[PDB]
Amino acid sequence: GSHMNPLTQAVPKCQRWEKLQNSRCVCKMPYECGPSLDVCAQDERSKRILPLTVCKMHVLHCQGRNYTLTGRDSCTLPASAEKACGACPLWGKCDAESSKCVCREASECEEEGFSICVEVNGKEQTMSECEAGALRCRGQSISVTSIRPCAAETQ
């Protein structure tokens, strides 16, 4: 007989830079992103270090664009550190009447948030963008190794 359920047997899970359409996982659009971690990447044709952001890089990467990642000192990011009220990311918001921006913790991760590999505590832990970002905002010492996940998650 026919399959009662399409060939996945559940709803297909697509990656952070992907969206499920036409029964497949396709990439989203890079301009459909904003809330993501700002990183320094090198353009393969220009060889310039340009500020990219995790979703931008990921989506554009799966769209067939080639970019090499560089160090956090290679470029200057819009948000490389803490922000102030009037301009806050997804891991940071303006608090109850102030001029500052407070950095939230991982427990307030509401927006999508990618999964990245960051070396914290001397270990490479895959955490969510909202978490790693919160850390980078609050003052936790974090060393982003890559915008891809770590092999921390392996059972």
Curated annotation (Swiss-Prot):
Location in or out of the cell: Secreted; Target cell membrane
Annotated glycosylation sites: 8, 66
Modification note: C-, N- and O-glycosylated. O-glycosylated with core 1 or possibly core 8 glycans.
Renumbered residue ranges of the record's region Factor I module (FIM) 2: 83-155
Disulfide feature: 14-25, 27-62, 33-55, 40-75, 85-94, 88-101, 103-137, 109-130, 117-150
Start and end residues of each stretch annotated as Factor I module (FIM) 1: 7-82
Main function: Component of the membrane attack complex (MAC), a multiprotein complex activated by the complement cascade, which inserts into a target cell membrane and forms a pore, leading to target cell membrane rupture and cell lysis. The MAC is initiated by proteolytic cleavage of C5 into complement C5b in response to the classical, alternative, lectin and GZMK complement pathways. The complement pathways consist in a cascade of proteins that leads to phagocytosis and breakdown of pathogens and signaling that strengthens the adaptive immune system. C7 serves as a membrane anchor.
Associated disorder: Complement component 7 deficiency: A rare defect of the complement classical pathway associated with susceptibility to severe recurrent infections, predominantly by Neisseria gonorrhoeae or Neisseria meningitidis.
Family the UniProt entry places it in: Belongs to the complement C6/C7/C8/C9 family.
Subunit organization: Monomer or dimer; as a C5b-7 complex it can also form multimeric rosettes. Component of the membrane attack complex (MAC), composed of complement C5b, C6, C7, C8A, C8B, C8G and multiple copies of the pore-forming subunit C9.
Protein's name in the database: Complement component C7
Species the sequence originates in: Homo sapiens (Human)
Recorded name of the encoding gene: C7
Complete-protein stretch covered: 693 to 843 of 843
